[PDB]
Write a protein that binds this ligand. Structure first.
Ligand SMILES: [Ca+2]
Length: 557
């Protein structure tokens, strides 16, 4: 299946390329950079959402599923992009955002008018408690309550995300039909698949029970916010009504998912989705459940990474399918977060890439990951994301569960905007992103980190990624082989083995700044190896003295 063998490149289009000079990346800009992506070697593009939206959550608050936001272009520009993707032998996946819409979507503008409106039951409306307060103690992921009051009609509406992202009512069959008609509209025009935004949230517990009260916080995000009673029923209905009618790929964004849930979504026999993004490996550097959420930082712990990635590799080894990612539009640059982004930036970027691309699953490359883009030193006032604005207000100003200094430090490590500063094309003004003024500043280190310098340097992170993708297309063991963690207890080295039809692939990566040692276990000592890739210049893999961030992948001969 082409989706098993794919390498996906995720574009965050407002930050990719600005062809028309307004500072906002656009769909013709994407078209003009497709040759670059094909030369890297990715065969599938996932576009973050370009549908009409007032941009409260930068496109994830959609106000029209059948038209583009004007700064991206028009549907004609989108149809051309689909065509240009296909002319290059590639595929395009769009972002399906159907847990919620914008409050400016015509559906919601109508819903909120009156209880008798035909759109009233497209959304989730509930009476206040007798004292006027919210139906329950559920929280929003972007801080505060999940409920907002509408004075006109005397009810609250639910939003798991912002107050400008009212949640759709999937109990109403008319809403399910509306979603399936959106999907067919785009698929009939050549969209090859969907990345499904917060897909585990679409089914609600319609009794809306309170969470057990904590004492540490007023609003709670927990187990009712996902995996509702009708979740898999709905995904199975979407497959029958839509996905089964096209040659397509689907990936669900699945924050909160564990390995058994992943098998419910991804086991082919269940006729749901092809794969999902879990957050469990993204969650290793926060406390389990602080009121400060992901902003309650912990240092990188390689043993925690090895345990989580291994549970996923073994859990979906012979049923379902994994996604493989360290970066996306919601995550910091991994080398800044967990590694060295200075003197060992190249070695480190290549080392995290080798850990990831040596595994079973579909790899995702976030725009700029392939040139080693890094987190930004911009001051807090320059950040754009509503998530930061809302968390500063709740955690620092109001509840005082984080100090100013601690919050600033956490945002410098994990703010989503580190992913969103423009793609770095060359060393000229605004890194070649725009001839105008970019919507957020370009990262201050762009003169040293960009596509131009990368293509001029044979030792670039770019060529290393290009090689990993080539290897994947040449060596079927990388796609189909099983997985075994080796040297499990080593606190510096992530090593593992893939096996397929009597061939072995050995991946050994020192995720640390200091020297380390890998010794092959006893069963492998009489293997002969050929080195397929390494991030140091100078094949006896039974014993490897590893330099800082040294990575090597060998195949048995
Ligand atoms: Ca533009």
């Amino acid at each position: 299946e082409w989706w098993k063998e794919a390498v996906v490149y995720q574009i965050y289009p407002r930050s990719f390329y600005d062809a028309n000079g307004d500072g906002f990346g656009d769909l013709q800009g994407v078209i003009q950079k497709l040759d670059y992506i094909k030369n890297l070697g990715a065969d599938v593009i996932w576009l973050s959402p370009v549908f009409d939206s007032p941009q409260d959550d930068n496109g994830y608050d959609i106000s029209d599923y059948k038209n583009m936001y004007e700064k991206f272009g028009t549907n004609e520009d989108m149809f051309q992009l689909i065509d240009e993707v296909h002319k290059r032998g590639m595929k395009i996946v769009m972002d399906l955002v159907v847990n919620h819409t914008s409050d400016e979507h015509a559906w919601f503008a109508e819903s909120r008018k009156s209880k008798d409106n035909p759109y009233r039951d497209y959304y989730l409306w509930k009476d206040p408690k007798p004292d006027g307060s919210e139906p329950n103690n559920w929280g929003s992921i972007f801080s505060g309550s999940a409920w907002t009051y509408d004075e006109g009609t005397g009810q609250y509406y639910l939003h798991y995300f912002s107050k400008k992202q009212p949640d759709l009512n999937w109990e109403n069959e008319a809403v399910r039909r509306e979603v399936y008609d959106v999907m067919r509209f785009w698929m009939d025009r050549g969209v090859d698949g969907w990345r499904m935004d917060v897909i585990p949230s679409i089914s609600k517990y319609t009794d809306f029970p309170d969470y057990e009260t904590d004492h540490s916080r007023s609003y709670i995000v927990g187990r009712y916010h996902s995996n509702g009673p009708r979740l898999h029923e709905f995904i199975q209905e979407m497959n029958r009504e839509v996905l089964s009618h096209y040659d397509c790929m689907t990936v669900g964004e699945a924050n909160g998912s564990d390995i058994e849930e992943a098998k419910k979504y991804t086991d082919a026999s269940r006729q749901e989705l092809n794969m999902i993004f879990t957050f469990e490996h993204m969650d290793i550097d926060k406390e389990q459940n602080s009121p400060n959420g992901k902003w309650q930082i912990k240092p990188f712990d390689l043993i925690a990474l090895k345990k989580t990635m291994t549970r996923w590799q073994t859990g979906l080894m012979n049923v379902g399918w994994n996604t493989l990612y360290f970066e996306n539009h919601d995550q910091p640059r991994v080398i800044s977060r967990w590694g060295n982004d200075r003197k060992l930036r190249k070695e480190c970027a290549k080392a995290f890439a080798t850990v990831l691309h040596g595994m079973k699953g579909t790899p995702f490359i976030y725009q700029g990951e392939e040139i080693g883009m890094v987190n930004s030193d911009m001051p807090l006032e320059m950040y754009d994301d509503l998530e930061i604005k809302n968390a500063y207000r709740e955690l620092v100003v109001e509840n005082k569960t984080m100090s100013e200094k601690e919050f600033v430090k956490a945002v410098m490590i994990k703010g989503r905007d580190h992913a969103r500063t423009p793609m770095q094309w060359d060393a000229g003004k605004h890194a070649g992103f725009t001839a105008g003024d970019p919507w957020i500043p370009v990262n201050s280190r762009y003169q040293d980190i960009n596509v131009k310098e990368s293509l001029e340097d044979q030792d670039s992170i770019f060529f290393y990624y290009q090689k990993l993708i080539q290897l994947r297309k040449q060596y079927k063991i990388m796609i189909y082989g099983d997985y075994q963690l080796l040297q499990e207890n080593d606190p510096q080295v992530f090593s593992y083995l893939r096996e397929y039809r009597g061939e072995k692939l050995l991946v050994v990566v020192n995720l640390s700044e200091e020297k380390a040692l890998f010794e092959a276990p006893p069963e492998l000592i009489h293997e002969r190896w050929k080195v397929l890739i390494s991030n140091y210049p100078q094949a006896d893999l039974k014993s490897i003295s590893l330099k800082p961030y040294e990575a090597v992948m060998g195949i048995s001969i």
